[PDB]
Amino acid sequence: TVDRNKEDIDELPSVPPSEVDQGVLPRLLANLVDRRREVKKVMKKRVQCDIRQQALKLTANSMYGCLGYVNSRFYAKPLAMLVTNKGREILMNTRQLAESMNLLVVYGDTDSVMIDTGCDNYADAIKIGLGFKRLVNERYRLLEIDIDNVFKKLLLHAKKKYAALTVNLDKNGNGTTVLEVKGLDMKRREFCPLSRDVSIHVLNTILSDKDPEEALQEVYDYLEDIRIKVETNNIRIDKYKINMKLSKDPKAYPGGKNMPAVQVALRMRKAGRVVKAGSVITFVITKSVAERAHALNEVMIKSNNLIPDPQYYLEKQIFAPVERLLERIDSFNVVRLSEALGLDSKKYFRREGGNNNGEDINNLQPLETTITDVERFKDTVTLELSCPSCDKRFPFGGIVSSNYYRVSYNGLQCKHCEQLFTPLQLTSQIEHSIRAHISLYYAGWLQCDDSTCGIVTRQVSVFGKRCLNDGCTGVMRYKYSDKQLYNQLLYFDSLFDCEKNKKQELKPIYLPDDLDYPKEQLTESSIKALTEQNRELMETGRSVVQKYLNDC
Amino acid sequence: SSSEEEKKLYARLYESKLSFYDLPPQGEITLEQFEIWAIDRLKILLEIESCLSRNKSIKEIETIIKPQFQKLLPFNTESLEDRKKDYYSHFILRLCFCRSKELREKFVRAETFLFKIRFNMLTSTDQTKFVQSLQFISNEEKAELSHQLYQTVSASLQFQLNLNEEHQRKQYFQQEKFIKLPFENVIELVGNRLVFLKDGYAYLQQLNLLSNEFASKLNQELIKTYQYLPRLNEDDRLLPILNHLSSGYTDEINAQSVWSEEISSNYPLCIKNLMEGLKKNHHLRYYGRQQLSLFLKGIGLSADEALKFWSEAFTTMEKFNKEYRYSFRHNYGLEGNRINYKPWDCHTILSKPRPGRGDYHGCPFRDWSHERLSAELRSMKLTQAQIISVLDSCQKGEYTIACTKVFEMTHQTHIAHPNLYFERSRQLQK
Amino acid sequence: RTMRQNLQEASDVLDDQIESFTKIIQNHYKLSPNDFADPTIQSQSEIYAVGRIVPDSPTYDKFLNPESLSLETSRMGGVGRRVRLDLSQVNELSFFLGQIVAFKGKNANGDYFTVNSILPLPYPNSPVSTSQELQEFQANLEGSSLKVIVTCGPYFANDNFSLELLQEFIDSINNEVKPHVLIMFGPFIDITHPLIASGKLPNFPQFKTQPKTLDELFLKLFTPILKTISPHIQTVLIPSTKDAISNHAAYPQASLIRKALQLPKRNFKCMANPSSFQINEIYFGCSNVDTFKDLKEVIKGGTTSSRYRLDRVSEHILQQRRYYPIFPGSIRTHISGADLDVSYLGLTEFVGGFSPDIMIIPSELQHFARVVQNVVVINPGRFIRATGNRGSYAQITVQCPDLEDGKLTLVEGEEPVYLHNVWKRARVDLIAS
DNA sequence: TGTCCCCTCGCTGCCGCCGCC
RNA sequence: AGGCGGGCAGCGAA
Numbered sequence A: 001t002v003d004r005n006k007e008d009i010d011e012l013p014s015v016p017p018s019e020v021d022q023g024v025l026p027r028l029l030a031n032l033v034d035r036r037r038e039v040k041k042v043m044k045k046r047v048q049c050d051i052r053q054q055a056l057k058l059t060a061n062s063m064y065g066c067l068g069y070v071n072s073r074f075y076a077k078p079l080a081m082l083v084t085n086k087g088r089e090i091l092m093n094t095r096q097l098a099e100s101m102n103l104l105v106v107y108g109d110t111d112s113v114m115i116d117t118g119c120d121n122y123a124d125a126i127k128i129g130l131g132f133k134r135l136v137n138e139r140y141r142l143l144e145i146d147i148d149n150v151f152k153k154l155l156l157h158a159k160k161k162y163a164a165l166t167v168n169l170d171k172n173g174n175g176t177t178v179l180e181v182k183g184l185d186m187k188r189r190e191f192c193p194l195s196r197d198v199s200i201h202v203l204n205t206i207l208s209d210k211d212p213e214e215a216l217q218e219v220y221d222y223l224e225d226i227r228i229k230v231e232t233n234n235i236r237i238d239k240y241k242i243n244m245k246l247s248k249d250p251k252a253y254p255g256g257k258n259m260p261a262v263q264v265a266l267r268m269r270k271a272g273r274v275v276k277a278g279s280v281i282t283f284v285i286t287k288s289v290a291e292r293a294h295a296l297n298e299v300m301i302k303s304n305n306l307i308p309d310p311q312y313y314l315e316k317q318i319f320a321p322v323e324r325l326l327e328r329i330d331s332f333n334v335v336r337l338s339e340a341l342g343l344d345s346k347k348y349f350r351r352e353g354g355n356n357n358g359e360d361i362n363n364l365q366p367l368e369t370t371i372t373d374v375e376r377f378k379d380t381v382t383l384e385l386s387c388p389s390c391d392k393r394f395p396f397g398g399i400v401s402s403n404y405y406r407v408s409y410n411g412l413q414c415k416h417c418e419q420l421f422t423p424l425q426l427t428s429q430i431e432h433s434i435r436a437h438i439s440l441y442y443a444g445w446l447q448c449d450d451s452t453c454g455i456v457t458r459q460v461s462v463f464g465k466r467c468l469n470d471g472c473t474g475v476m477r478y479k480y481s482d483k484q485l486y487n488q489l490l491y492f493d494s495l496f497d498c499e500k501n502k503k504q505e506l507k508p509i510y511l512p513d514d515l516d517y518p519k520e521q522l523t524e525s526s527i528k529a530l531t532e533q534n535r536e537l538m539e540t541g542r543s544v545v546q547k548y549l550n551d552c
Numbered sequence B: 001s002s003s004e005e006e007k008k009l010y011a012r013l014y015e016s017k018l019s020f021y022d023l024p025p026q027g028e029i030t031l032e033q034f035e036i037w038a039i040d041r042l043k044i045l046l047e048i049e050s051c052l053s054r055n056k057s058i059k060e061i062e063t064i065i066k067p068q069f070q071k072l073l074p075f076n077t078e079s080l081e082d083r084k085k086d087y088y089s090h091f092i093l094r095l096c097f098c099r100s101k102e103l104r105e106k107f108v109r110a111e112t113f114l115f116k117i118r119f120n121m122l123t124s125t126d127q128t129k130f131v132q133s134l135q136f137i138s139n140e141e142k143a144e145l146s147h148q149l150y151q152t153v154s155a156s157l158q159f160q161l162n163l164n165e166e167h168q169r170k171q172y173f174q175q176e177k178f179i180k181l182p183f184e185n186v187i188e189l190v191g192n193r194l195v196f197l198k199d200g201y202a203y204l205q206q207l208n209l210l211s212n213e214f215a216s217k218l219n220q221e222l223i224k225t226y227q228y229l230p231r232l233n234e235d236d237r238l239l240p241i242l243n244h245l246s247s248g249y250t251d252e253i254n255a256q257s258v259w260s261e262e263i264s265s266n267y268p269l270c271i272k273n274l275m276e277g278l279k280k281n282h283h284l285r286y287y288g289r290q291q292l293s294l295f296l297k298g299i300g301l302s303a304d305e306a307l308k309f310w311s312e313a314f315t316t317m318e319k320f321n322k323e324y325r326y327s328f329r330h331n332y333g334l335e336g337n338r339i340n341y342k343p344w345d346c347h348t349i350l351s352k353p354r355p356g357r358g359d360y361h362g363c364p365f366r367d368w369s370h371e372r373l374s375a376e377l378r379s380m381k382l383t384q385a386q387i388i389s390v391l392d393s394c395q396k397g398e399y400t401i402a403c404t405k406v407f408e409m410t411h412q413t414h415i416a417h418p419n420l421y422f423e424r425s426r427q428l429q430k
Numbered sequence C: 001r002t003m004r005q006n007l008q009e010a011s012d013v014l015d016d017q018i019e020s021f022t023k024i025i026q027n028h029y030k031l032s033p034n035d036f037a038d039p040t041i042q043s044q045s046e047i048y049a050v051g052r053i054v055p056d057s058p059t060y061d062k063f064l065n066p067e068s069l070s071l072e073t074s075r076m077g078g079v080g081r082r083v084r085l086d087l088s089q090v091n092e093l094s095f096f097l098g099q100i101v102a103f104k105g106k107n108a109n110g111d112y113f114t115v116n117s118i119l120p121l122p123y124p125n126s127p128v129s130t131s132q133e134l135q136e137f138q139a140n141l142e143g144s145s146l147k148v149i150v151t152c153g154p155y156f157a158n159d160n161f162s163l164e165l166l167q168e169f170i171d172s173i174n175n176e177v178k179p180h181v182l183i184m185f186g187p188f189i190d191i192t193h194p195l196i197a198s199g200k201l202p203n204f205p206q207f208k209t210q211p212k213t214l215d216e217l218f219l220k221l222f223t224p225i226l227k228t229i230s231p232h233i234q235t236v237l238i239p240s241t242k243d244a245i246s247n248h249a250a251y252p253q254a255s256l257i258r259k260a261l262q263l264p265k266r267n268f269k270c271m272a273n274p275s276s277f278q279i280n281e282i283y284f285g286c287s288n289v290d291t292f293k294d295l296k297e298v299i300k301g302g303t304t305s306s307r308y309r310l311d312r313v314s315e316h317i318l319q320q321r322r323y324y325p326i327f328p329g330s331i332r333t334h335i336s337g338a339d340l341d342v343s344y345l346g347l348t349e350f351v352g353g354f355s356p357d358i359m360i361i362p363s364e365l366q367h368f369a370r371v372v373q374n375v376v377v378i379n380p381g382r383f384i385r386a387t388g389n390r391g392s393y394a395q396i397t398v399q400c401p402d403l404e405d406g407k408l409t410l411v412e413g414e415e416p417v418y419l420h421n422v423w424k425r426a427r428v429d430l431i432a433s
Numbered sequence D: 001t002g003t004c005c006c007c008t009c010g011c012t013g014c015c016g017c018c019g020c021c
Numbered sequence E: 001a002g003g004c005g006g007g008c009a010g011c012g013a014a
């Protein structure tokens, strides 16, 4: 169904229109979705059927994945490009729709959004969620969105890593909480079960409804209790295991003298164990790091008399994971955490403040760069744009909030008519504004310094700076100074520079009292994602300005 | 003007590797290159001025500034871009520094000294080529006066070119050419008697004459540029840059003596600990390295002598040059932003992390056990009452007070700086 | 050069115009510098005054009358002061703003310069060529006459981007007309085009890859069409200040980069605005700013008014020896304008002081071809009209030079040289596009 | 005969290199 | 000893 350029696999086709008959791929995928839905209706034996439904989901996902496998007999790179393109588009539209209803999206990941409902109860947020679902499902015939989980408290550590308290309803309207984690140092196999258990206890304590400082004190008490237990070796060895699977043969690792699992695998191979590529290496650091790592089975032998090193664990397996866990938590004293775990507090003191700056008089700083861009572009006028379709005129202000244009994932969009600016329809307007300003500059209007004369003319005397009024002593100067025109061109350049837009260093286009003041302000993550998604359009709009900045 | 004409005019302008900066440059360069080149030459010139204000020797000065040549304004290169960098930077600074007489004096002094250096690393063939590019005497006239000229210039050759052997001096004199000039232009050499003087003419020590002529011509051109500046006051681009650049202006202790008892007797306890740990382990760790290096810099150890001492204490040269030479030169502020780092005082030393096993930095009055400190005091012939006194001072956290007590018993009372300790100990012997 | 406007350099060039024309008038009329005095001060004696026509008030009404003009003296002549003009004693005149004039009068009272006679500026000399050059050009032409076509922009209507009539024109010049040199003026991609101004750039199904900038629009929409031009026809482009493909928005305007336009070296050349060049013995003076429409005269006298306006404009320009003598330049209220780079009016003057054999200044007025002061003036008009109807282009046919027919006049002197007689040998036909 | 499990993004630890305070 | 820049390898996640 999709017409594509077979001479260049990197060129992206467009969606085939409605009149083309449903094809082969959508039909097969619909059948597979029906099968998995029937399996889920069977769910509603349970664990075995869950294996069944996740296998069917994996089959459905592979039906898309092999559109990106090079050695697949049905390799179609443009297809996978287009599916990912549309997926990102729907994520962008969903987030923008969320902002349209004054809703706080706190995260999103490739098919999902997380919305802070501002509610202290379950049903209050559920009503908003159902309204959101109804509003979004109307946009698509077969795409449908649905509530997956409800989190009473959400802790976002970083990208792909977060922990939450899932609200699970019961038969008789009863609601229970369950700790759900994704991608953290807990869920890893490189981290010991001891780290897992203590981190589970820490998150259970923080996300529970207790006084924040009291929560931190309880966590600290737990922490030095574990410190004493680890130091005295009063813990069963089994909780010390570290798992790391080697993708390559332990002979083919160049810097394997540092990573310990390679040494453990070499010792196992010498001892008479079969270790190859893809094998999982389990080991324990005993008392360099790699030279003190030995397998569990060797360590479980009391005849060896191997005691795990409390120092390495108490630093890296425990302190760093908890420090990462509570980084964004209010009044998190990392120094107190290290003191509870007995680590050097000077190593952590430089992370809170970034250490002392340190500098002499650095005169490598031209006064051209030291001038703030805000004062440079203060004496400028905004760019004006006309929509090619609805002919509405709006001031463009970069990738920023406005009542007239949206920087959609595909490109610049008008709010009034929802049409998409082609790159030419924006570059031509940019060039028109630039040339109009240049022609006004070359109009050669002259202005007199004197305040009681102030006359503006295009007449110049053979004495250029002499005012043409009888006896006027004022200094005659150009009305459109080339400094002002350079400022305006630099403003047009800044409006299309990705870096400035991402740091939000663009001059606001509306004063707070303006009736056209944007009612919904873009989030920083949104601006970063958009400026990365429209990099080509921004760079072309900047190159148009650079056409006239190089000559100036 | 075309690119070919510009290249030809430039090759004519730099037929010699050095230039007198007579004809202003022709061409168009961006504001980026303008500001960058002006800043580069101003940095080199500020470094020459800082060296002058410390009364450093000429040889030391070129040793410091040769890498700055390789970095900022590389010389002795066939690249046209570098030569134009030099020319436009000189004329840009000419524009910037002509506003006041003091600025003109500073600029001409620094530029003439830079000319002296640049003529110094230029080779004798290249020096002859530049000088030829002030009348040279013929071969017969040199032969007639060969004995007197050789007598006049023998001492100068020996003391400047280090030609201690007489045969080398004679060979250099045979190839050396001379210029016939009157004594009124060479009076400074006439007073010192570095030039043979006959019939009112002085036979040229040519670098001094060249530098004096450079200074005179440069001052005249600076005055002329100041006259022409009001016409160039009309441009908005250059004026802020010129204003910014104008405001931008505004051994007894050697590698072997620090090992000797005479100098080590004036050390404090901490520096003795660092020195002894260095001797035992032939290597010191980062905080100890910086502490000892900054103390040695404070007591007057030169950068070259510090490098020799640090290299000999670390008994390969490859890893040394790779990893420690830059640190030991950067402590002296010769690279980066060139920070002449102040030696750590006792508060800075006590603010550093506490030393561990193998770490020798810090304060012994804080980091050592009372037993080890007491033994070190018995090694200094301190009586038991004195030991109890310094231990009482240490127990209260007054480590500086304990060090001051140790100074007084072993030899404005309070000492809060190891370099102050060393200086007062040296004064007590002076 | 760069987009810089310096007031002092502007004033220096403005003064230099007066100074040079004062020297020229003194040389031609055999007058001593003592005969020239300051007209801004009271004098009891008639004097010669040279200056620039300027309004009596710096903030002036758009319409001017002979009672509302003034004269601008040079720095040396009258300390740059401006004095009112009294034209009651002269009956026939034609003045415009920015004109340089040579005058005879007396300042009777101090506040007015009473005009008694005007000194007509001498017409500059015509180019000359030797016998060997003319014989070589005759051999080049192989007996046949010389054919040149001049076309001016814009090349497409205001409601479409179609260039089919361009295809028909190229077909004609390739297969039937077969000229020697083709001259095309700008703007090619006009920046004042209405769809371009409003951004209504449509998706073009005829390009595999849609253009993203107006320069790419030119490379995809003009360039392949200009490639269809035959190799045997040499072509020249003279840009205008309204070209979107040009990064030089001032007059005078530098030549466009032929490599930037992707267009082959085999038969294509790009010249500046203004420009002057030779095809065989011919002289061209080409400027792409509308002086005919913009020049607004102040006229007295029945005889002067009874003359053709175009002839008067041509005489004014030939006397001024610069292609756009009006100062300040015209503006379009802001949309566009003359965009005079007053610092560089020197490039706008006649090259070498010669009157061009053929003077071509495109104008928005009706196409015309006239002979004024032995100089032919051509305006082929816009290749297309606003409504898209057929425009016009001019074909210039010049007879092959021959020393025996006598149409070339010999110039007396030790060096035997021959003036070109263009108006005797050139037929200009304005063809509907 | 010889195969495979989408790339791509962001996160953490380790290793070697470079400049700096 | 510390922050940054580019490179490799290991791994959790969409």
Ligand code: SF4
Pocket: B268, B269, B270, B271, B345, B346, B349, B350, B362, B363, B364, B365, B399, B400, B401, B403, B404, B416, B417, B418, B421
């Ligand atoms: S008090 Fe100061 S000088 Fe004395 S040992 Fe301690 S750190 Fe060194």
